[PDB]
């Protein structure tokens, strides 16, 4: 009963596919792109380890084909019969690098605009703006589309604000559920 | 021009997901039976023809479920996709062996869109 | 001049300036058409509402082009008074948001929500909103425009005065379109702060 493989494509720069094997054996990973060009079976050229034991595989940019159905396969080398395979939609697994260069700037004495950049992709990312004042018990969050801005139409000068943003590869170039990590917060 | 062209796709994609996002919260039993055929190869835009051909069934499938659940008018969306699908080609559609569910169907074309919408801008 | 705007659902609104008169809307790729009698507004201006379908049904697309003609009776026949090749999604104007209500009022604060009415899902989140507040000292014109460069169906107003009478209004515009204009202002929502 082999461990479930979880593969994730990072800002479409490379892919890390990992599994916990401790539940001592060197399981192997093999992968291929079903129903397409180069349907050949490729052996893992880069292993990732946990305690001198295979713990994942890392696929580099050129090995990554979102939009092409990705099939990955874990093999117990002792028994051919102990194999588990997963077909993967890679465009639903992309995690963008978190937003950077957060800047605030006024367009009135009481109206703010928050801005940010993305590492590579641009029209492909949606965003979540979270903010709270030194007065809030909780974050006000707000979803924002590919205009990587956020307006704050009414702000309190006596209070001090905190902003942070995370991004998601959805819904135009993929359907990923997972968000990037949060950007470095910035203050007002 | 491409500028005109990507926007249209974005749209197509969009209510392709309206159908998807409308059949999950939902006779999805009887609905998950109908068997669609998917393209052998869907890479270039002209391939969308293989999408036009199946639309007739797509409608006859959605009229299984009455109109209260869905947030889209079936005859409408289809009627609208078709229009997209038409302006977007400008050849013969060769099909795949295996047969997929409406869900596995949309998923596939939705993705087809996300490809071209990535590879441009 | 002859000007029409698409509401993103099933409605095309028309204005004509130059006796019986009509507007005919013929979609270049649909099996339907629709008309309505033009009625007077200004001294020499006529308006009209073309009902393409059910209130929220999506009857036109961004690839659709609707040929719009205005016709006035000329003896036996009809006369073509004006013609236009109308791209619905290049001429968008949305209804004013509705269902305005106070989510939460404090003594120095207020939180107000609204709904967009009949907005096409083709827009997803590529929307814009403008809001403004009528405070006791000013008129509507002098009231500052509050910018929301995102789809956000609420606003938290800060820097309010307790026991003060306020009125609030908000309008909406899609990002898409060369001739798209702001929606009309919403029905003003009236509210008053706690002491
Ligand atoms: C985001 C990410 O890639 N996480 C880590 C990465 O830092 C590391 O280089 C790789 C190999 O250990 O395993 C994983
Ligand atoms: C550089 C590399 O190959 N992987 C790194 C390694 O330091 C580790 O796996 C992790 C946390 O220490 O961050 C990543
Ligand atoms: C099976 C085992 O004990 N651990 C091995 C280690 O000795 C070897 O160097 C490495 C590279 O293949 O794979 C792992
Ligand atoms: C183009 C862009 O937005 N990326 C910038 C990068 O050039 C710069 O080195 C970094 C640190 O300031 O911030 C980010
Ligand atoms: C429809 C709406 O705006 N409801 C929101 C909800 O989405 C959000 O989780 C919460 C915290 O900001 O505030 C409320
Ligand atoms: C400032 C603030 O809390 N804004 C809230 C918002 O989060 C919520 O979605 C909405 C619905 O109750 O009411 C308003």
The two three-digit tokens of residue C50, written as one number = 């073309």
* A56 and A113 co-located in one domain: no
Residue nearest to atom 5 of ligand 1 (CA): A16
Map tokens 């795949």 to a residue.
B96
A103 and A182 housed in the same domain: yes
Let me know how long chain B is.
121
| Torsion, Cα of A140, A145, A151, A152 (10° steps) | -10
Instruction: Check: CB of residue C18 under 8 Å from CB of residue C82.
Output: no
Domain harbouring A182, CATH code: 2.60.40.10
Domain identity same for C124 and C192:
yes
Q: What's the half-sphere exposure (Cβ side, CA atoms, 13 Å) at B10?
A: 23
Domain range enclosing C189:
94-195
Q: CA C3: distance to chain centroid?
A: 14
**Residues linked to residue A165 through DSSP beta bridges, in sequence order:** A129
**Through-space distance between the first and last CA atoms of chain A, rounded to whole angstroms:** 53
In angstroms, what is the span from residue C116 Cα to ligand 6's centroid?
16
Domain boundary residue, one of A68, A93, A118: A93
Backbone φ and ψ of C57, nearest 5°: -70, 145
Ligand 5: centre distance to CA A96 (Å)? 24
Q: Which of A89, A124, A171 sits opposite B118 (nearest CB)?
A: A124
Rounded Cα gap, residues A111 and A85, in angstroms: 53
Q: Is there a single domain that holds both residue A86 and residue A122?
A: no
Task: Of C55, C49, C47, C62, give the one whose Cα is nearest residue C9.
Answer: C55
Structural contact between residues C194 and C160, judged by C-beta atoms closer than 8 angstroms: no
**Tokens 């307006």 map to which residue?**
A151
SS3 of A123-137: the string is CCEEEEEEEEECCCC
Measure CA of the first residue to CA of the last residue in chain B; give whole Å: 12
Contacts with A145 from chain C: Cβ below 8 Å? 124-126, 150-151
Residue C168 sits in a domain whose CATH number is 2.60.40.10
Domains of chain B: 1-121 (1.20.1250.10)
Query: Exposure string (b/e) for B66-88, b if CB count within 10 Å is 16 or more?
Result: eeeebebbbebbbbbbbbbbebb
According to the entry, how was the structure determined? Answer: X-ray
Side-by-side strand order, sheet with A14-18: A47-49, A54-60, A14-18, A6-10, A94-95
Contacts of C147 in chain A (CB under 8 A): 107, 111, 113, 151, 153
Q: Which of C81, C82, C66, C8 is nearest to C33 (CA)?
A: C66
Interface check for B67 against chain A (CB to CB < 8 A): the answer is no
* Structural tokens at position C38: 């033009």
Residue A52 belongs to domain spanning: 1-93
Residue C153 in tokens:
């169906």
Residues C165 and C195 both lie in one domain: yes
H/E element holding C174? Answer: strand C165-174
- Contact between C186 and C114 under an 8 Å Cβ cutoff? The reply is yes
Question: Quick one: which of B76, B91, B83, B84 has its CA closest to B112?
Answer: B84
């Amino acid at each position: 009963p082999l461990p479930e493989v979880q593969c994730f494509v990072f800002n479409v720069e490379y892919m890390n596919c990992t599994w916990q094997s401790s539940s001592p054996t060197n399981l192997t990973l093999h992968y291929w792109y079903k129903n397409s060009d180069n349907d050949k079976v490729q052996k893992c050229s880069h292993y990732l380890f946990s305690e001198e034991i295979t713990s994942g595989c890392q696929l580099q940019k050129k090995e990554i084909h979102l939009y092409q159905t990705f099939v990955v396969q874990l093999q117990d080398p002792r028994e051919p019969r102990r194999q588990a395979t997963q077909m993967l939609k890679l465009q639903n697994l992309v995690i963008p690098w978190a937003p950077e260069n957060l800047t605030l700037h006024k367009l009135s004495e009481s109206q703010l605009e928050l801005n940010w950049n993305n590492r590579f992709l641009n029209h492909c990312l949606e965003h979540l703006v979270q903010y709270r004042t030194d007065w809030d018990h909780s974050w006000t969050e707000q979803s924002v589309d590919y205009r990587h801005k956020f307006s704050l139409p009414s702000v309190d000068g006596q209070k001090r604000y905190t902003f942070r943003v995370r991004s998601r590869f959805n819904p135009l170039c993929g359907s990923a559920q997972h968000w990037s990590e949060w950007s470095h917060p910035i203050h007002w | 021009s491409t500028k005109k062209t990507q926007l249209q796709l974005e749209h197509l994609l969009l209510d392709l997901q309206m159908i998807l996002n409308g059949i999950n919260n939902y006779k999805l039993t009887r609905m998950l039976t109908f068997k669609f055929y998917m393209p052998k190869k869907a890479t270039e835009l002209k391939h969308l023809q293989c999408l036009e051909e199946e639309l007739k069934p797509l409608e006859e499938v959605l009229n299984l479920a009455h109109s209260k659940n869905f947030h889209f008018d079936p005859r409408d969306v289809v009627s609208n996709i078709n229009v997209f699908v038409l302006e977007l080609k400008g050849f013969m559609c060769e099909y795949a062996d295996e047969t997929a569910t409406i869900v596995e169907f949309l998923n596939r074309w939705i993705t087809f869109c996300q490809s071209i919408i990535s590879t441009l801008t | 001049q002859f000007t029409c705007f698409y509401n993103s659902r099933a409605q095309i609104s028309c204005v004509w300036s130059q006796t019986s008169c009509q507007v005919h809307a013929w979609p270049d790729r649909r099996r339907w058409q629709q008309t309505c009698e033009l009625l007077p507004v200004s001294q020499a201006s006529w308006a009209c509402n073309l009902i393409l379908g059910a209130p929220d049904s999506q009857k036109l697309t961004t690839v659709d082009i609707v040929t719009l003609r205005v016709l006035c009776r000329e003896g036996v026949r009809w006369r073509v008074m004006a013609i236009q090749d109308f791209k619905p999604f290049e001429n968008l104007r949305l209804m004013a948001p509705i269902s305005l209500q106070v989510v939460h009022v404090e003594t120095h604060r207020c939180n107000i929500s609204w709904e967009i009415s009949q907005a096409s899902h083709y827009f997803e989140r590529h929307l814009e909103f403008e809001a403004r507040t009528l405070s006791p000292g000013h008129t509507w014109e002098e009231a500052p425009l509050l910018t929301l460069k995102q789809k956000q169906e609420w606003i938290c107003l800060e820097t309010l005065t307790p026991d003060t009478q306020y009125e609030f209004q908000v309008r909406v515009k899609p990002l898409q379109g060369e001739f798209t204009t702001w929606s009309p202002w919403s029905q003003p929502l009236a509210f008053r702060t706690k002491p």
